[PDB]
Design a protein around this ligand. Sequence first.
Ligand code: 4YS
Length: 112
Amino acid sequence: MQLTPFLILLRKTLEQLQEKDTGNIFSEPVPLSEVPDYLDHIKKPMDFFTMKQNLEAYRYLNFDDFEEDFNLIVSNCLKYNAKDTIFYRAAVRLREQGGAVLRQARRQAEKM
Ligand SMILES: O=c1[nH]ccc2ccccc12
């Protein structure tokens, strides 16, 4: 497999995932200044901006490593927030809508 088309695919996929996060609550790192206890519970914070940075730093050379960090966005949010919150529901919705985006993107990677 060639690097350039793969990274083009991942860029598109990340844009598509970001589109599902309509409130943009996962666009940037959880502000540790406003959520001071966040690192007490969450071992590896993740967000779409950080994913973009990782993508361009060649930290995603296969689909699984890409998907693993997306899954962290979801799981961190489910872990930190109570079930009766907007944030928790948003993570559930992102898991649902994102999974479909991921399945289609992976099929296109596998054709490479
Ligand atoms: O774990 C989180 N992900 C995205 C937003 C957020 C906001 C407050 C607390 C946790 C999170």
